[PDB]
Design a protein around this ligand. Structure first.
Ligand code: HEM
Ligand code: HEM
Ligand SMILES: Nc1cccc(CCc2cccc(OCc3ccc4ccc(N)nc4c3)c2)n1
Ligand SMILES: Nc1cccc(CCc2cccc(OCc3ccc4ccc(N)nc4c3)c2)n1
Ligand SMILES: [Cl-]
Ligand SMILES: [Cl-]
Lengths: 362, 362
C-alpha cells in the first residue's frame, strides 16, 4: 500500500513543480513514466531539475523560517550516488567548505540517497554538522548542554572530548547494514569560528566567547513528492539573535548574561533595572559586530524582518498563499519592533517541506 | 429562546461558583429560584457574592493576562442600582479615585446594570476611562493616533481639545433611551500622571514624555452565568512594557524611538547597531524608574512573569486547568528571558470571562 500514497504525492508535486518551471506540457508523459516506475520498482527517482526545485520549494514552505526571501537561490548539491562512508564523509566535508565559502556563506543543501522502503540508507546523528560538545557530571557543567546526549553517545564509540567549553563534535553517521555509526574528527581548517568582541567595550573579550560560522542543520527530513530524504543537511547564515539571545544567553545553554552584565559594568541585582534586557542588547550587538568584523555572513533581526516583508509581497504578487508560524517568526529581541509581530500568519503545512525525525540515540 | 441559553449558562456558573465557595449544598435551591425567575422575568439577578466571585473568575480565565496571580483580590464595586447620567458619571469618578488610591493602585472593577434583552442600559464609549486624545489633519500628527476616531466623535458632540500631545479625553457614555451620549471633563485632581525621566541620563527629560497612572479598560463585556455586563470598567496596574514598548514606542502610537536614541547619545543609522533595541531598553528603564519614583504602582515584565509562574503552580495545586494565549502572554521586550516563552498554553475559552464588543462609533 506504500505506493498508493507515493503516487498521490508525486502527482501533486510534479504538476506544481513543472507548472512553476514552465514545463506544464511535459507533465503528462513524466507522470506515466512515474506510474510505470512505481509499479515496477516500488518508488521513483527525481530528475536533477525536480530535486533542485523541490528542495527550493521546501524552503519556501518552511513556516518557521524568516529567511525565505532567498529560497530560489539555494545551491543544491546532488549526492544520491553515495554508497560508502568515505564518500558520505567527504561530501559532508565538501558541504562545510563550499557553504562556508571563506565567510561569504552560500545557502547550500547536500542531498543523500532517500529512504528506500522507509529503511534509511545514511543516518546522520549530528544535529548540526558543526556544533560544540557538552558534558555534565559531578555537578560540573562544561560546554553546550544541548549537546549532552549526543556527546555521551559519541564517547561510547571511542571518541573523547578535551572538555573545553567549545569542543567540536565529530561527524557521526551510520550506513545501512552497519550497526554502529562511524565518527570522524572535523578538520579544523574547514571550520571558521568567530571570537565575540564588542565594538565599544574592550573588556568584553575577557568573557572568551566564540561561536562557529555556519549553522548546518543535519537532522531534518526533506520530503519532495513522496520521497523521504532523511539525510539532507542544509545551511543558511545565522540571524544574530540565534547566537546572542539563545545559544549564548539561555539558562539551559551557555547562560552568559550575568557575566555579560559584569563586563559591561551594570549591576545584576534588580529586575526593575532591566539588566537582563540591557545585557541581551550588548551581547547581540557584539555578535553582529564580530561576525561582520571577521567577514562572516550574518543578518540582524531588523534586516531579516524587512527581507521577510519582501517575501510576503513576492508571494502575493505571484498568487501563492503565504504560510507562517508567528511564534517562530518573531525574533526573541524587540519583536514588536518588526512588522511580523503586528500581523498574523496561516500555519498550514504545505509540501515539499522539511520535517523533524526521531533521533537514533538517547 | 433567549432563556434556554441563559438557563444553561446559569447552571454551569452557579454549580462551579458555589463549589469554589464551599456552598455546594445551597446549589439546589438557588437554581430553582433561578428557573422560576427566568420563566417569570426573562432573566435573573446575581447575588452580591455571585457577582463578586464571577468577576474574579472572569479575570482568572483571561487567557491573555499575565497578571492573574492576584485574581482573588479584585475589589468589586456593585453599581447595578445606577439609573441616571449623574450616577454613572459619579461612579466612574469614584472608580478612578478608589482604584488610584494615591498611587497604591487597587485592582478594581465597577459593575453597572447588565444588558436586559441584549438592549444596553449604559454604553461607555471610552476605551479606557483615562486616555489621551489624538488628531490627524493636513498632515499634522498630534497626540495618540489610537484615539483619533473617538476624539473625532467627541468633537462632534461639542467637546474641543487643546491639541497638546496629552489632552485627556472626557468621559463619554450613552444612557438607554437617550440618543446621543453625554460627555464630562475629567477633574484633573483625580488623574495621576507620571513624567518620564531616566535614572542616569538627565537629558531624557528633554523629551517631555508622560503617561497616566492607571489603565482602566472600559469597553469590554463581562459575562457571568449568561448575564452580559457590557459596562464593567476594570483596572490593574501597568506592566512597564505596555508604556515603554508599545504606547510610547509603536510607529502607530507616539513613535518616540528616534528621539530616545538621540537623547541617549547613540546613532540611529544602521540596523546592525541595534539602536532600536537599545532605545527600547532605556525607554523601558525610564518608565519603571519614573513610576516607582513617583509612588505609582507598576511591575516589570520579569517580576510579572515570575508571578505568572506562581499562578500556573497555584492552578495545578488547585486541580484547575490553566488556559493562556502565548502570543499575548510573552512580553514584547526580551520575551525568551521569561519562562512563558519556553512553554505552551491551551488557548481554550472558559467562562466567566471578559470579551470584546463592537464600538458604538466610527
Ligand atoms: C539564508 C539565511 C537564513 C536565515 C537567516 C534563516 C533564519 C531562520 C531562523 C532564525 C530560524 C529559527 C527561528 C526561531 O528560532 O524562532 C529558522 C528556522 C528554519 N529555517 Fe531558516 N534561515 C535561513 C536559511 C534557511 C535555509 C537555507 C533553509 C533550508 C533550505 C531553512 C529552513 C528553515 C527551517 C526548516 C526552519 C525551522 C526548523 C525547525 O522547525 O526546527 N532556512 N530560519
Ligand atoms: C493587577 C495588575 C495587572 C497586570 C500587570 C496585567 C497585565 C496585562 C497585560 C500586560 C495585558 C496585555 C498583554 C499584551 O499586550 O500582550 C493584559 C491583558 C488583559 N488583562 Fe490583565 N493585568 C492586570 C490586571 C487585570 C485585571 C484587574 C483584569 C480584570 C479584572 C485583567 C484582565 C485582562 C484582560 C481581559 C486582558 C486582555 C484584553 C484583550 O483581549 O484585549 N487584568 N493584562
Ligand atoms: N520557545 C520557543 C519559542 C519559539 C521558537 C522556538 C524555537 C527555538 C529553536 C530551537 C532549536 C532550533 C531552532 O532553529 C532550528 C533552525 C533550523 C534551520 C535554520 C536555518 C538557518 C538558520 N539561521 N537557523 C536555523 C535554525 C530554534 N522556541
Ligand atoms: N501584535 C500583538 C501581538 C500580541 C499581542 C498584542 C496586543 C497588544 C494590545 C493592544 C491593545 C490593548 C492591549 O491590552 C489591552 C489590556 C486589557 C486589560 C489590561 C489590564 C491590565 C493591564 N496592565 N493591561 C491591560 C491591557 C494589548 N498585539
Ligand atoms: Cl544554532
Ligand atoms: Cl494602555
Amino acid at each position: 500500500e506504500e505506493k498508493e500514497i507515493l503516487w498521490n504525492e508525486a502527482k501533486a508535486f510534479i504538476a506544481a513543480c513543472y507548472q512553476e518551471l514552465g514545463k506544464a506540457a511535459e507533465v503528462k508523459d513524466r507522470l506515466a513514466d512515474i506510474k510505470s516506475e512505481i509499479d515496477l520498482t516500488g518508488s521513483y527517482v527525481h530528475t536533477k531539475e525536480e530535486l533542485e526545485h523541490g528542495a527550493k520549494m521546501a524552503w519556501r514552505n518552511s513556516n518557521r523560517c524568516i529567511g525565505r526571501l532567498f529560497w530560489n537561490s539555494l545551491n543544491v548539491i546532488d549526492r544520491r550516488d553515495v554508497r560508502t562512508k568515505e564518500e558520505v564523509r567527504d561530501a559532508l566535508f565538501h558541504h562545510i567548505e563550499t557553504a562556508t565559502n571563506n565567510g561569504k556563506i552560500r545557502p547550500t543543501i547536500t542531498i543523500f540517497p532517500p529512504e528506500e522502503k522507509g529503511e534509511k540508507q545514511v543516518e546522520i546523528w549530528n544535529h548540526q554538522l558543526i556544533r560544540y560538545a557538552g558534558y555534565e557530571s559531578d555537578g560540573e557543567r562544561i560546554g553546550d548542554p544541548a549537546s549532552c546526549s549526543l556527546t555521551a553517545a559519541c564517547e561510547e564509540l571511542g571518541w573523547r572530548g578535551e572538555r573545553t567549553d567549545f569542543d567540536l563534535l565529530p561527524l557521526i553517521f551510520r550506513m545501512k547494514g552497519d550497526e554502529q555509526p562511524v565518527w570522524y574528527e572535523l578538520p579544523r581548517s574547514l571550520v571558521i569560528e568567530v571570537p565575540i568582541t564588542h565594538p565599544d567595550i574592550e573588556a568584553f573579550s575577557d568573557l572568551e566567547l566564540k561561536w562557529y560560522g555556519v549553522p548546518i542543520i543535519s537532522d531534518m527530513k526533506l520530503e519532495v513528492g513522496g520521497i523521504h530524504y532523511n539525510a539532507a543537511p542544509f545551511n543558511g547564515w545565522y540571524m544574530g539573535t540565534e547566537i546572542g539571545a539563545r545559544n549564548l544567553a539561555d539558562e539551559k545553554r551557555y547562560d552568559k548574561l550575568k557575566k555579560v552584565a559584569s563586563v559591561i559594568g551594570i549591576a545584576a541585582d534588580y529586575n526593575t533595572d532591566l539588566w537582563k534586557d540591557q545585557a541581551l542588547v550588548e551581547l547581540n550587538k557584539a555578535v553582529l559586530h564580530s561576525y561582520k568584523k571577521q567577514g562572516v555572513s550574518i543578518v540582524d533581526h531588523h534586516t531579516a524582518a524587512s527581507q521577510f516583508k519582501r517575501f510576503e509581497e513576492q508571494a502575493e504578487e505571484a498568487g501563492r498563499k503565504l504560510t507562517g508560524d508567528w511564534t517562530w517568526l518573531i525574533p526573541p529581541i524587540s519583536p514588536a519592533a518588526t512588522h511580523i509581530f503586528h500581523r498574523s500568519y496561516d500555519n498550514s503545512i504545505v509540501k515539499p517541506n522539511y520535517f523533524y525525525q526521531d533521533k537514533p540515540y538517547e
